[PDB]
Design an enzyme around this catalytic site. Structure first.
Site, PDB file in Angstrom:
ATOM      1  N   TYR A   1       0.817  -1.090  -0.123  1.00  0.00           N
ATOM      2  CA  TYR A   1       0.157  -0.076  -0.077  1.00  0.00           C
ATOM      3  C   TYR A   1       0.889   1.062   0.147  1.00  0.00           C
ATOM      4  O   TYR A   1       0.514   2.245  -0.702  1.00  0.00           O
ATOM      5  CB  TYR A   1      -1.075  -0.030   0.925  1.00  0.00           C
ATOM      6  CG  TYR A   1      -2.332  -0.853   0.633  1.00  0.00           C
ATOM      7  CD1 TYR A   1      -2.933  -0.709  -0.152  1.00  0.00           C
ATOM      8  CD2 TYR A   1      -2.327  -2.344   1.578  1.00  0.00           C
ATOM      9  CE1 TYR A   1      -3.956  -1.401  -0.800  1.00  0.00           C
ATOM     10  CE2 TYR A   1      -3.438  -3.041   1.123  1.00  0.00           C
ATOM     11  CZ  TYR A   1      -4.329  -2.522   0.037  1.00  0.00           C
ATOM     12  OH  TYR A   1      -5.236  -3.582  -0.252  1.00  0.00           O
TER      13      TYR A   1
ATOM     14  N   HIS B   1      -2.905 -13.151   3.508  1.00  0.00           N
ATOM     15  CA  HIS B   1      -1.866 -13.747   2.891  1.00  0.00           C
ATOM     16  C   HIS B   1      -1.664 -15.138   3.773  1.00  0.00           C
ATOM     17  O   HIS B   1      -0.803 -15.957   3.441  1.00  0.00           O
ATOM     18  CB  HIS B   1      -0.503 -13.260   2.752  1.00  0.00           C
ATOM     19  CG  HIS B   1      -0.488 -11.713   2.506  1.00  0.00           C
ATOM     20  ND1 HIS B   1      -0.269 -11.436   1.019  1.00  0.00           N
ATOM     21  CD2 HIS B   1      -0.631 -10.601   3.157  1.00  0.00           C
ATOM     22  CE1 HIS B   1      -0.508 -10.111   0.939  1.00  0.00           C
ATOM     23  NE2 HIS B   1      -0.689  -9.507   2.176  1.00  0.00           N
TER      24      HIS B   1
HETATM   25  C1  HEA Z   1       0.971  -3.186  -4.439  1.00  0.00           C
HETATM   26  C2  HEA Z   1       0.476  -3.819  -3.256  1.00  0.00           C
HETATM   27  C3  HEA Z   1      -0.712  -4.536  -3.444  1.00  0.00           C
HETATM   28  C4  HEA Z   1      -1.994  -4.154  -3.677  1.00  0.00           C
HETATM   29  C5  HEA Z   1      -2.719  -2.754  -3.874  1.00  0.00           C
HETATM   30  C6  HEA Z   1      -2.897  -5.268  -3.713  1.00  0.00           C
HETATM   31  C7  HEA Z   1      -4.447  -5.532  -3.827  1.00  0.00           C
HETATM   32  C8  HEA Z   1      -5.313  -6.139  -3.349  1.00  0.00           C
HETATM   33  N1  HEA Z   1      -4.992  -7.550  -3.080  1.00  0.00           N
HETATM   34 FE1  HEA Z   1      -3.132  -8.272  -3.377  1.00  0.00          FE
HETATM   35  N2  HEA Z   1      -1.123  -9.343  -3.153  1.00  0.00           N
HETATM   36  C9  HEA Z   1       0.038  -8.526  -3.141  1.00  0.00           C
HETATM   37  C10 HEA Z   1       0.178  -7.264  -3.216  1.00  0.00           C
HETATM   38  C11 HEA Z   1      -1.046  -6.123  -3.366  1.00  0.00           C
HETATM   39  N3  HEA Z   1      -2.241  -6.451  -3.531  1.00  0.00           N
HETATM   40  C12 HEA Z   1       1.198  -9.454  -3.203  1.00  0.00           C
HETATM   41  C13 HEA Z   1       2.582  -8.800  -2.869  1.00  0.00           C
HETATM   42  C14 HEA Z   1       0.896 -10.691  -2.975  1.00  0.00           C
HETATM   43  C15 HEA Z   1       1.441 -11.958  -3.168  1.00  0.00           C
HETATM   44  C16 HEA Z   1       2.198 -12.240  -1.811  1.00  0.00           C
HETATM   45  C17 HEA Z   1       2.555 -13.653  -1.535  1.00  0.00           C
HETATM   46  O1  HEA Z   1       3.934 -13.801  -2.040  1.00  0.00           O
HETATM   47  O2  HEA Z   1       1.916 -14.544  -1.145  1.00  0.00           O
HETATM   48  C18 HEA Z   1      -0.624 -10.737  -3.560  1.00  0.00           C
HETATM   49  C19 HEA Z   1      -1.612 -11.519  -3.429  1.00  0.00           C
HETATM   50  C20 HEA Z   1      -2.828 -11.276  -3.039  1.00  0.00           C
HETATM   51  C21 HEA Z   1      -3.464 -12.307  -1.760  1.00  0.00           C
HETATM   52  C22 HEA Z   1      -2.876 -13.217  -1.187  1.00  0.00           C
HETATM   53  C23 HEA Z   1      -3.429 -14.702  -1.733  1.00  0.00           C
HETATM   54  C24 HEA Z   1      -2.306 -15.581  -1.378  1.00  0.00           C
HETATM   55  O3  HEA Z   1      -1.244 -15.285  -1.541  1.00  0.00           O
HETATM   56  O4  HEA Z   1      -2.802 -16.838  -0.738  1.00  0.00           O
HETATM   57  C25 HEA Z   1      -4.831 -11.533  -1.232  1.00  0.00           C
HETATM   58  C26 HEA Z   1      -5.624 -11.990  -0.330  1.00  0.00           C
HETATM   59  O5  HEA Z   1      -6.497 -11.390  -0.116  1.00  0.00           O
HETATM   60  C27 HEA Z   1      -4.978 -10.446  -2.003  1.00  0.00           C
HETATM   61  C28 HEA Z   1      -5.974  -9.617  -2.283  1.00  0.00           C
HETATM   62  C29 HEA Z   1      -6.066  -8.061  -2.831  1.00  0.00           C
HETATM   63  C30 HEA Z   1      -7.132  -7.119  -2.473  1.00  0.00           C
HETATM   64  C31 HEA Z   1      -8.544  -7.476  -2.309  1.00  0.00           C
HETATM   65  C32 HEA Z   1      -6.710  -5.995  -3.202  1.00  0.00           C
HETATM   66  C33 HEA Z   1      -7.324  -4.624  -3.182  1.00  0.00           C
HETATM   67  O6  HEA Z   1      -6.653  -3.468  -2.505  1.00  0.00           O
HETATM   68  C34 HEA Z   1      -7.852  -4.272  -4.558  1.00  0.00           C
HETATM   69  C35 HEA Z   1      -8.309  -2.938  -4.672  1.00  0.00           C
HETATM   70  C36 HEA Z   1      -8.927  -2.527  -6.111  1.00  0.00           C
HETATM   71  C37 HEA Z   1     -10.206  -2.946  -6.472  1.00  0.00           C
HETATM   72  C38 HEA Z   1     -11.165  -3.462  -5.493  1.00  0.00           C
HETATM   73  C39 HEA Z   1     -10.665  -2.749  -7.904  1.00  0.00           C
HETATM   74  C40 HEA Z   1     -11.298  -1.460  -7.977  1.00  0.00           C
HETATM   75  C41 HEA Z   1     -12.639  -1.096  -7.566  1.00  0.00           C
HETATM   76  C42 HEA Z   1     -13.645  -1.008  -8.317  1.00  0.00           C
HETATM   77  C43 HEA Z   1     -13.687  -1.339  -9.716  1.00  0.00           C
HETATM   78  C44 HEA Z   1     -14.947  -0.924  -7.581  1.00  0.00           C
HETATM   79  C45 HEA Z   1     -15.959  -2.353  -7.416  1.00  0.00           C
HETATM   80  C46 HEA Z   1     -15.248  -3.383  -6.827  1.00  0.00           C
HETATM   81  C47 HEA Z   1     -15.591  -4.141  -6.028  1.00  0.00           C
HETATM   82  C48 HEA Z   1     -17.371  -3.884  -5.450  1.00  0.00           C
HETATM   83  C49 HEA Z   1     -14.597  -5.235  -5.288  1.00  0.00           C
HETATM   84  N4  HEA Z   1      -3.692 -10.199  -3.298  1.00  0.00           N
HETATM   85 CU   LIG Z   2      -1.545  -7.995   1.283  1.00  0.00          CU
END
Ligand code: HEA
Ligand SMILES: [Cu+2]
Ligand SMILES: CCCCCCCCCCCCCCCCCC(=O)OC[C@H](COP(=O)([O-])OCC(O)COP(=O)([O-])OC[C@@H](COC(=O)CCCCCCCCCCCCCCCCC)OC(=O)CCCCCCCCCCCCCCCCC)OC(=O)CCCCCCCCCCCCCCCCC
Ligand code: HEA
Ligand SMILES: CCCCCCCCCCCCCCCC(=O)OC[C@H](COP(=O)([O-])OCC[N+](C)(C)C)OC(=O)CCCCCCCCCCCCCCC
Ligand SMILES: CCCCCCCCCCCCCCCC(=O)OC[C@H](COP(=O)(O)OCCN)OC(=O)CCCCCCCCCCCCCCC
Ligand SMILES: CCCCCCCCCCCCCCCC(=O)OC[C@H](COP(=O)(O)OCCN)OC(=O)CCCCCCCCCCCCCCC
Ligand SMILES: CCCCCCCCCCCCCCCC(=O)OC[C@H](COP(=O)(O)OCCN)OC(=O)CCCCCCCCCCCCCCC
Ligand SMILES: CCCCCCCCCCCCCCCC(=O)OC[C@H](COP(=O)(O)OCCN)OC(=O)CCCCCCCCCCCCCCC
Ligand SMILES: CCCCCCCCCCCCCCCC(=O)OC[C@H](COP(=O)(O)OCCN)OC(=O)CCCCCCCCCCCCCCC
Ligand SMILES: CCCCCCCCCCCCCCCC(=O)OC[C@H](COP(=O)(O)OCCN)OC(=O)CCCCCCCCCCCCCCC
Ligand SMILES: [Mg+2]
Ligand SMILES: [Zn+2]
Lengths: 67, 51, 121, 45, 118, 104, 269, 59, 534
Positions: free
Chosen positions: I245, I291
């Site tokens: 973030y 995670h």
């Molecule tokens: C830059 C950092 C970053 C950001 C911003 C995000 C964004 C999000 N991520 Fe992600 N994620 C990672 C970094 C990040 N992620 C990393 C590094 C991994 C791998 C880690 C590892 O090595 O295991 C990972 C993998 C990861 C996991 C781990 C899964 C696993 O490893 O088992 C999860 C779990 O919840 C997840 C969920 C989300 C969600 C819900 C958002 C949300 O914040 C997204 C928000 C955006 C939207 C929601 C879309 C725009 C919105 C609309 C269009 C409105 C309508 C939408 C709805 C009504 C939903 N992503």
């Molecule tokens: Cu995360």
């Protein structure tokens, strides 16, 4: 201005062709031999074994992917 | 002392007045940057197997 | 040569007049005694009544156009001015650069800004 | 509006040709895996 | 050397604001209140803190003498009579790079013996 | 004022804002601030804009009013029933349009 | 006053620092320290002589940096009230970052304590490990911090007041009070039934108390520097930001010690 | 010993940089330069001995 | 010149050096991405013959180098150091030696990370460097110690920059900047600098616990001995979600500014947008264990975390809706940073939708440590932070560097990176839902097609960066000739409709922040006098 949209789409397709050719001649020097279970003759046995035990019955189960 | 300002006195590269062309330094910087993982791969492939 | 130490803000003559006298052998030093330079200048100013480094949002009471501009003051030849309407918050903040030889016209508010450039370079 | 061609027609004329090109650009921004699967040997090419 | 005509004109306005002079006279009120509240706190110190330190010192001297005679009791114990203790106690993943290999920083050789499993 | 502006308050505020301009920057500025709103202005605004562009004595901002308006309106029937309402002001002020000036 | 002698000054209260060679040197020393203590932990170099000199060159470069900052703060005279509020808020945010390291250590203690593993005997403290009782030496070195806080706050309020013989006496006795704390803490370490390797209890206990130990020896060095520049007439009556900094630090160190002491000596036994 | 205004009168009135402006600042920086150069150049001759993998001669 | 680049306590000449290490490390990290995706192109042992430990070393190098040495410098360090004093009217930042030591302790973390990949074969754990995979029994050597000393140094650099940023926009603002009048990139750097010093202390505590149970015989995560490796997963991901973030919030600020200035419209509800961004910041701590849905948490706490990650998802949604609202009704001038800003919205909405597909603790049991996750984060991290980085460079560097780039080469670079990066990470979703796990050297040869398609795409995504390098060269040696000889675009804000050219030459730049009023390359003492505002 003045046909530069034509220049930029020419540059995009030229870049796609250049990267394709350089990926090909980088791919050419990788490794001589394949893993032996890559040709189609192994794949027919490897999915005959699958249909012996009806794995993936409604979806796809046939594995060939080789010429 | 306030250092004097211009169009080429904001960066560490000297560009206009040199002896060698600028393309040498500018592409050797990213040559060593792009070739540090290759030398890591070479020092790791002579330590275990062959190459 | 001969130097006194600027008992208030009227007698400063550069960075050699802000020294002040030292403390004695037993007393704790006050800030009037030992502080020197820019901090001593701000302390002497605040003890006189004024405060230096005049921070104030600019006068956006009247609009002001080329018959009588909005006069701003700067010790340099330019001063970045962020106009925000004829009230304090009318339209969004638009940044203009009035300089010594050109007035600055807002294009959304419409107001103009002109300097009296103090300078002494 | 009040006098002129009606707003339903004069915005349908603007937007109805836009829906087909939106469908084209979305069907080629998400549908190129179909085009790369179509030529491979998995589809008995 | 040709001063601009805005040179010797004034620059700051009327220097008799009541706000900064009342600030300068509150600079005496802070010093008077500090001369009160330091005397108050040094009375707090010499009345409250020092008897508590004295009582805690005689308590800790009594039980430190008890722990000292207990350490002199467990000085002369032969090492195979030290109890075989558990798996989490005295872990050694890699040897310590300083010393012989089994010695920490404040490793007392009386209370912290390595039993080496008979 | 973040409260909404009715059409009569709009046209009165902008007529008193077109009357006061004296330079060219002021006329083009208040013309841009009048056209970049949501509605298209009634011709009581725009004939006053033509007079205010006549007072500064420059021509092409008394033509770009008409082209900006053609970009503003929703069709060309509104544009024609508009332009026959500003006929005689365009006649005795002598400004042209675009399509007859640059035939293409 | 005249414009001619008003435009001969800074025109804004903020600091303009001349180019100083103490980010680059202490960063060099930090690199050498990190590589040499990654290199001697595996027997690549023979002794700890090189990690000793790397730690020493880091210490002497940072004390030369603090020499440069005390010379710039009280001799060249730039720390006006805006810069003073700036460095005060910067130290507040730095200490807010330190207490979060302490919160991570407390998270480790709580997570391995209130859900004890089946290899510890399913009881906190584990079997066999004679835990330290909180009432003998912990009571002395938890009352000594309160007495240190009381004497450093009357030394502060005597520094604001004007007397020198009281504002110096409080600083001298708080320095000797917390170094008596540090010495009896080392006395507590050198006769304790468990080491840093003996289980997870000794590990997280010694981690928390040793981080607080190193924090207060750094506080003692800070207070020694502050007593030296209080004796040499640097500290004024209204421009002592480098002393308000260290009293904020010692009061938050006192309260984080009481948190650490309660849940490391009463609840955890 | 109330020697702050003499030090201020010295420190304002010079051209040399700040870490060289004190009178006794020659005894603080020459041995520092020596020991710092030694202490930071010295692991960069032990790093190829670590890349080759040859450990120390201890015990 | 030694005192202007080695001592150099001036926040303009530190950001250029930040950017130089950023482009150097990004080149090294994308060389590692090219080597990874070149080895994963076909089943059977390719270019690196056997030797899975070398592939683990390469993937941890790619991940940690490109996260902590490209994105975090070139977004926090470089852009904040150049622009945060230059938007609020400070002459330059507070604590200047602190953000000099932050920059100068970056590349020593870089050189110890580089020399960590050479000694005793090497640290292979992935960037989430886990026990007991990294304890001394299952991984012997001084490699991962240098690999986490790099994280100690980068951690120290980013925290010092965070304290620097927080105090320099809490005190040294200009005359009229109130508590809510700042431009939105200042607010992004503000909130990111809070999340740094509220998050990474926990990281550095956890990884120094990993170091002193590697070498100092303690037992934090050595399980036969009392500890547990689940405590490291908690103590790591408590930083691991605030870290991304942190990496994405200045991206939101950059994209807000470029869509504000290339559509001739203010952002739709800046106060609600900054409230959404601040709530995203203060809410991103409460969802750290999304995670860890697999490791054995209760269904009750899993229900709590799958409730709370959707309330994480909503204010990003209202930010993207405000972006659509502020580009709606504009006069969109499609130049090359506006193209990146338009592509960022779609290519981050796609990754956020697959992220909320991942966020269900029910659904994470079918997708964890699986290439679906790679398709999600290589959308929202790669395309997100680096399309915002490109829309930062192509929008700000004519003002900073003072040399205008080539325009048609910038547009072919955008379309090449857009096509050639959309073709990589889109088959990763099909590889994920078909069942491919992460960090394998290569795979059972069923899914042999999508890896080949992704590998033919990564060469396009590398060739576009080579063209970006040539864009840097053509900007550096043909800046004034691209000013004069009609190859570039000169005015980023076009003249309005009814405004003449002779009237546009009066008010040239219609900005809303200070930065486009300073001259190209700006003076070393820009604000001699304060910059007033009402
Ligand atoms: C830059 C950092 C970053 C950001 C911003 C995000 C964004 C999000 N991520 Fe992600 N994620 C990672 C970094 C990040 N992620 C990393 C590094 C991994 C791998 C880690 C590892 O090595 O295991 C990972 C993998 C990861 C996991 C781990 C899964 C696993 O490893 O088992 C999860 C779990 O919840 C997840 C969920 C989300 C969600 C819900 C958002 C949300 O914040 C997204 C928000 C955006 C939207 C929601 C879309 C725009 C919105 C609309 C269009 C409105 C309508 C939408 C709805 C009504 C939903 N992503
Ligand atoms: Cu995360
Ligand atoms: C082997 C074939 C190599 C050339 C490729 C075929 C070709 O000529 O295409 C050019 C062709 C237009 O050539 P042209 O308009 O005759 O040349 C422009 C002028 O002559 C103006 O061109 P110029 O005379 O200034 O150019 C000097 C010339 C100098 O070239 C040389 O010195 C000879 C060596 C060239 C090969 C190396 O440089 C080139 O033309 C490079 C051509 C590649 O471009 C295209 O067809 C579209 C671009 C590609 C689209 C995507 C394709 C996938
Ligand atoms: C910064 C984040 C980031 C980015 C941008 C990328 C981008 C790429 N990554 Fe990935 N990757 C990770 C972080 C990232 N990655 C992480 C955290 C993991 C998990 C590791 C693990 O869990 O084990 C991972 C894992 C991972 C995998 C999955 C392997 C596996 O775990 O099984 C693959 C395979 O293709 C890969 C390769 C690539 C390639 C070819 C790119 C290409 O997109 C690279 C091309 C990118 C560019 C061309 C960007 C422009 C570059 C510049 C330098 C621009 C300069 C501009 C400015 C400075 C303004 N990396
Ligand atoms: C001027 C250069 C022109 C090209 C020179 C020849 C390039 C070439 O021959 O590439 C071979 C690859 C075959 O790729 P492969 O079937 O995986 O074989 C790998 C080679 N081994 C390791 C077995 C030895 O072939 C390819 O990979 C070509 C790329 C795939 C098809 C191109 C798609 C792009 C659109 C057209
Ligand atoms: C949204 C994107 C939709 C278009 C995808 C194009 C795929 C073309 C292709 O490659 O489809 C090829 C496959 C062939 O596989 P087979 O089972 O016949 O294999 C047998 C081999 N002997 O067709 C299908 O299985 C189903 C038809 C397409 C279904 C679309 C995808 C459905 C799931 C969505 C996955 C994406 C999740 C994204 C998450 C954010
Ligand atoms: C978007 C624009 C860029 C897309 C490039 C995708 C190329 C992937 C590839 O390289 O395609 C690989 C496939 C499968 O070939 P194979 O696995 O049988 O070959 C085994 C080793 N040769 O070959 C083709 O289908 C050739 C036709 C390509 C058609 C592309 C259409 C794109 C729309
Ligand atoms: C930046 C990261 C900051 C976070 C730091 C987290 C905690 C690390 C320090 C804990 C101190 C533990 C202690 O002081 O342990 C005391 C023990 C000695 O006890 P003993 O076993 O001899 O007891 C015997 C009972 N009869 O020393 C050790 O054996 C290990 C020492 C390791 C080296 C010191 C710590 C190295 C990291 C310091 C980082 C500082 C920054
Ligand atoms: C490792 C060794 C740690 C030694 C700490 C020495 C502190 C003395 C600094 C000093 O003396 O700084 C004096 C200055 C200003 O003094 P002043 O303006 O109050 O004087 C004005 C008189 N008229 O205070 C500061 O700017 C704050 C300094 C905080 C430094 C914290 C460093 C913490 C490092 C942890 C690792
Ligand atoms: C470890 C991180 C230590 C951060 C200390 C924050 C102090 C805040 C402050 O008040 O910093 C004040 C000063 C820096 O200020 P300056 O000279 O730039 O100020 C110019 C006047 N406005 O001391 C420091 O920070 C030095 C900290 C590093 C010392 C070595 C640490 C090695 C590890
Ligand atoms: C998909 C396409 C893949 C293949 C591309 C090959 C090269 C094409 C060159 C195009 C060109 O050259 O575009 C140049 C023209 C410029 O025209 P103008 O309006 O300025 O003309 C004015 C004449 N005086 O288009 C444009 O910039 C407008 C289109 C912008 C596209 C932005 C795309 C951002 C990423 C996608 C975002 C979501 C959109 C898709 C989903 C709805
Ligand atoms: Mg996992
Ligand atoms: Zn205005």
């Amino acid at each position: 201005g003045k046909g530069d949209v034509a220049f930029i789409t020419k540059g995009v397709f030229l870049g796609l062709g250049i990267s394709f050719g350089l990926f090909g001649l980088v791919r050419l020097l990788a490794n001589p031999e394949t893993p032996k279970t890559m040709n189609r003759e192994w794949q027919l046995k490897s999915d005959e074994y699958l249909k012996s035990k009806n794995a993936n019955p409604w979806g796809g189960y046939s594995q060939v992917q080789s010429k | 002392v306030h250092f004097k300002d211009g169009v080429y006195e904001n960066i560490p590269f000297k560009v206009k007045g040199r002896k060698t062309p600028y393309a040498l330094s500018h592409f050797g910087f990213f040559a060593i940057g792009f070739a540090v993982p290759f030398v890591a791969c070479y020092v790791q492939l002579k330590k275990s197997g062959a190459f | 040569p001969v130097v006194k130490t600027a008992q208030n803000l009227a007698e400063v003559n550069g960075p050699e007049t802000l020294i002040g006298p030292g403390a004695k052998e037993g007393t704790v030093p006050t800030d009037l005694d030992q502080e020197t330079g820019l901090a001593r200048l701000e302390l002497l100013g605040k003890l006189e009544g004024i405060d230096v480094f005049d921070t104030k949002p600019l006068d956006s009471s009247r609009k002001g156009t080329m018959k009588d501009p909005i006069i701003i003051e700067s010790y340099d030849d330019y001063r970045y001015v962020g106009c925000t309407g004829s009230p304090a918050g009318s339209h969004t903040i638009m940044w203009l650069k009035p300089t010594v030889n050109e007035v600055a016209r807002c294009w959304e508010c419409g107001s103009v800004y002109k300097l009296n450039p103090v300078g002494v370079p | 509006g009040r006098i002129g061609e009606s707003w339903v027609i004069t915005e349908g004329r603007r937007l109805i040709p836009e829906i087909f090109q939106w469908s084209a650009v979305l069907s080629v921004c998400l549908g190129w895996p179909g085009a790369v699967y179509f030529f491979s040997k998995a589809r008995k090419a | 050397s040709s001063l601009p005509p805005n040179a010797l004109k004034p620059a700051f306005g009327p220097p008799d604001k009541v706000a900064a002079q009342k600030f300068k006279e509150s600079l005496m009120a802070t010093e008077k209140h500090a001369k009160d509240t330091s005397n108050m706190w040094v009375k707090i110190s010499v009345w409250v803190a020092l008897p508590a330190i004295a009582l805690t010192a005689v308590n800790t001297y009594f039980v430190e003498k008890e722990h000292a005679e207990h350490r002199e009791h467990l000085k002369h114990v032969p090492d195979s009579e030290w109890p075989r203790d558990y798996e989490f106690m005295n872990i050694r993943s890699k040897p310590f790079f300083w010393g012989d290999g089994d010695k920490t920083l404040f490793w007392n050789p009386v209370v912290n013996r390595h039993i080496e499993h008979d | 004022a973040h409260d909404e502006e009715t059409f009569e308050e709009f046209t009165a505020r902008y007529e008193k804002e077109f009357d006061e301009a004296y330079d060219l920057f002021e006329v083009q500025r208040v013309l841009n601030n009048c056209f970049s709103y949501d509605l298209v202005p009634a011709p009581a605004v725009i004939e006053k804009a033509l007079r205010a562009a006549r007072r500064v004595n420059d021509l092409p901002t008394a033509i770009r009013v008409f082209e900006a308006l053609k970009y503003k309106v929703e069709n060309e029937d509104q544009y024609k029933a508009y332009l026959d309402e500003l006929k005689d002001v365009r006649q005795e002020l002598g400004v042209p349009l675009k399509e007859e000036l640059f035939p293409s | 006053m005249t414009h001619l002698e008003r435009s001969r000054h800074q025109q804004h209260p903020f600091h303009m620092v001349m180019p100083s060679p103490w980010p680059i040197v202490v960063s060099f020393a930090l690199l050498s320290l990190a590589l040499s203590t990654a290199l001697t932990m595996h027997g690549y170099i023979g002794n700890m002589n090189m990690v000793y000199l790397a730690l020493f060159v880091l210490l002497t470069s940072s004390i030369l940096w603090f020499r440069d900052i005390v010379a710039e703060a009280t001799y060249l005279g730039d720390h006006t009230m805006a810069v003073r509020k700036g460095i005060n808020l910067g130290f507040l945010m730095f200490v807010l970052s330190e207490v979060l390291i302490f919160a991570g250590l407390f998270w480790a203690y709580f997570h391995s304590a209130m859900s004890p593993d089946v290899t510890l005997g399913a009881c906190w403290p584990p079997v066999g490990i004679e835990a330290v009782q909180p009432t003998e030496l912990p009571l002395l070195n938890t009352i000594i911090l309160l007495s240190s806080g009381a004497t450093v706050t009357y030394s502060h309020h005597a520094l604001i007041a004007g007397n020198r013989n009281k504002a110096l006496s409080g600083l001298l006795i708080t320095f000797w009070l917390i170094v008596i704390f540090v010495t009896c803490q080392y006395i507590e370490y050198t006769n304790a039934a468990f080491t840093i390797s003996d289980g997870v209890y000794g590990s997280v206990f010694y981690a928390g108390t040793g981080l607080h130990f190193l924090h207060m020896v750094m506080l003692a060095a800070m207070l020694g520097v502050n007593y030296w520049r209080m004796r040499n007439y640097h500290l004024t009556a209204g421009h002592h930001v480098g002393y308000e900094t260290t009293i904020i630090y010692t009061h938050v160190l006192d309260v984080i010690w009481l948190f650490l002491y309660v849940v490391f000596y009463w609840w955890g036994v | 010993a109330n020697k702050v205004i003499q030090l201020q009168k010295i420190f304002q009135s010079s051209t040399k940089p700040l870490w060289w402006r004190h009178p006794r600042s020659a005894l603080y920086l020459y041995p520092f330069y020596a020991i710092f150069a030694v202490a930071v150049v010295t692991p960069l001759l032990y790093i190829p001995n670590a890349i080759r993998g040859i450990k120390a001669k201890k015990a | 010149m030694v005192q202007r680049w080695l001592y150099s306590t001036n926040a303009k000449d530190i950001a250029v050096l930040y950017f130089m290490l950023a482009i150097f490390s990004g080149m090294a990290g994308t060389a590692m991405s090219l080597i990874i995706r070149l080895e994963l192109a076909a089943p059977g042992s390719q270019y690196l013959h056997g030797n899975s430990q070398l592939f683990n070393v390469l993937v941890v190098g790619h991940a940690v180098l490109m996260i902590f040495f490209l994105v975090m410098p070139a977004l926090i360090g470089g852009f904040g150091n150049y622009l945060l004093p230059l938007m609020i009217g400070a002459t330059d930042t507070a604590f200047p030696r602190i953000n000099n030591i932050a920059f100068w302790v970056l590349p020593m973390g870089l050189v110890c990370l580089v020399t960590s990949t050479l000694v005793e074969s090497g640290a292979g754990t992935g960037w989430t460097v886990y026990p007991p995979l990294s304890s001394i029994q299952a991984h012997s050597g001084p490699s991962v110690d240098l690999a986490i000393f790099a994280l100690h140094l980068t951690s120290i650099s980013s925290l010092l920059g965070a304290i620097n940023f927080i105090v320099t926009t809490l005190n040294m603002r200009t005359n009229g900047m109130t508590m809510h009048k700042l431009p939105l990139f200042v607010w992004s750097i503000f909130i990111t600098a809070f999340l740094l010093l509220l998050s990474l202390p926990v990281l550095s505590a956890g990884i120094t616990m990993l170091l002193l149970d590697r070498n100092f015989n303690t037992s934090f995560f050595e399980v036969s001995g009392g500890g547990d490796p689940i405590l490291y997963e908690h103590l790591f991901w408590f930083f691991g979600h605030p870290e991304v973030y942190i990496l994405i919030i200045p991206g939101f600020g950059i994209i807000s500014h470029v869509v504000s200035t290339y559509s001739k419209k203010p952002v739709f509800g800046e106060i609600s947008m900054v409230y959404a961004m601040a709530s995203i910041g203060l809410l991103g701590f409460l969802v750290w264990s999304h995670h860890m849905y697999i490791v054995g948490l209760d269904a009750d706490t899993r229900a709590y975390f799958t409730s709370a990650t959707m309330i994480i998802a909503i204010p990003t949604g209202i930010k993207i809706f405000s972006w659509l609202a502020t580009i709606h009704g504009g006069s969109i001038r499609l130049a090359t940073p506006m193209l990146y800003a338009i592509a960022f919205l779609f290519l981050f909405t796609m990754g956020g939708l697959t992220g909320v597909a991942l966020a269900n603790a029910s659904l994470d049991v079918a997708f964890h440590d699986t290439y679906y996750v790679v398709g999600h984060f290589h959308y929202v991290l790669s395309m997100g932070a680096i399309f915002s980085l490109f829309a930062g460079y192509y929008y700000w560097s004519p003002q900073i560097l003072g040399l205008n780039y080539n325009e048609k080469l910038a547009q072919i670079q955008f379309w090449l990176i857009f096509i050639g990066a959309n073709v990589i990470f889109f088959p990763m979703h099909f590889l994920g839902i078909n069942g491919m796990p992460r960090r394998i050297p290569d795979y059972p040869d069923a899914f042999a097609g999508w890896n080949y398609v992704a590998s033919i795409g990564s060469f396009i995504a590398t060739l576009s960066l080579f063209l970006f390098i040539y864009i840097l060269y053509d900007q550096l040696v043909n800046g004034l000739n691209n000013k004069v000889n009609n190859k570039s675009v000169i005015y980023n804000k076009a003249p309005d409709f009814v405004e003449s050219n002779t009237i546009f030459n009066l008010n040239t730049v219609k900005s809303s922040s200070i930065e486009f009023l300073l001259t190209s390359p700006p003076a070393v003492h820009s604000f001699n006098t304060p910059a007033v505002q009402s």
